[PDB]
Design a protein around this ligand. Sequence first.
Ligand SMILES: Nc1ccn([C@H]2C[C@H](OP(=O)(O)OC[C@H]3O[C@@H](n4cnc5c(N)ncnc54)C[C@@H]3O)[C@@H](CO)O2)c(=O)n1
Ligand SMILES: Nc1ccn([C@H]2C[C@H](OP(=O)(O)OC[C@H]3O[C@@H](n4cnc5c(N)ncnc54)C[C@@H]3O)[C@@H](CO)O2)c(=O)n1
Lengths: 124, 124
Amino acid sequence: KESAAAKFERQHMDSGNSPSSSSNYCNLMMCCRKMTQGKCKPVNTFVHESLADVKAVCSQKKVTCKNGQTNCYQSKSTMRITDCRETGSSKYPNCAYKTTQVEKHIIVACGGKPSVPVHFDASV
Amino acid sequence: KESAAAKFERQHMDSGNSPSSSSNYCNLMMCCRKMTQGKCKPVNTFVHESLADVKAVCSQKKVTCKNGQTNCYQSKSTMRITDCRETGSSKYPNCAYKTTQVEKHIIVACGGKPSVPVHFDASV
Ligand SMILES: Nc1ccn([C@H]2C[C@H](OP(=O)(O)OC[C@H]3O[C@@H](n4cnc5c(N)ncnc54)C[C@@H]3O)[C@@H](CO)O2)c(=O)n1
Ligand SMILES: Nc1ccn([C@H]2C[C@H](OP(=O)(O)OC[C@H]3O[C@@H](n4cnc5c(N)ncnc54)C[C@@H]3O)[C@@H](CO)O2)c(=O)n1
């Protein structure tokens, strides 16, 4: 059972965050986009550019993926992205992430026809 | 099954939003804070201030609640809040919300011993 006071805190209190400064962004989105089911996905980047701008990376600088595969492409320009990384304290099922906003080039692996991103490799 | 290109979109794409402009803030927070289990809570306000600052309202301008109850209090200073309201297409179990950030005085009902917030009444 939950107190009326505890209920007010759960429903109405979000001290330290807001839609214009959401440090809980990754915590929310990783849960929402289903990357915390069964285990916490360790790292995940969210890209804030247009889908067409990202599909287009498949047409830019060919590079080698981190593991060595050779179907990766580096974006010509830096992109507005958000890095989500588990915190040192993160313990499933309470997956915790550090939200970091940055502008960097991205490298994805592309596949199929036409060639579209099917894996996010790195941010540089 | 889900395709690799679809998986990539679900995991890495969020054009039009970011930790500094989270228009999906409400959609995310209403689900997280448990206000969409069963049905979609119609309206809800999130307060981005310290718990101390919100509890302190219980010591401010006594006023009558919307329904006529008289244990309501209005904040002397404005507060950073976010109004979450269901949208036209919102229908359980797919709850959708319009996020609106504003700065207004809040009115809450206080109760218990000691007196603390137990209900959010309105903003003004
Ligand atoms: N800055 C970073 C660094 C890492 N990451 C993430 C993305 C990766 O997940 P995901 O994009 O699902 O990719 C993993 C899936 O992709 C596939 N995959 C891996 N390498 C591939 C390749 N070269 N070509 C095609 N598919 C590949 C299979 C695998 O299930 C994860 C592990 O590398 O780390 C990130 O988001 N931001
Ligand atoms: N702009 C708005 C408009 C509406 N709302 C929300 C908050 C209300 O939820 P909640 O705070 O749980 O309040 C409901 C609970 O509060 C209690 N309650 C209602 N009035 C009370 C009062 N005057 N004193 C004590 N408890 C009261 C019991 C009930 O379970 C909900 C329904 O009015 O709408 C909002 O957040 N922002």
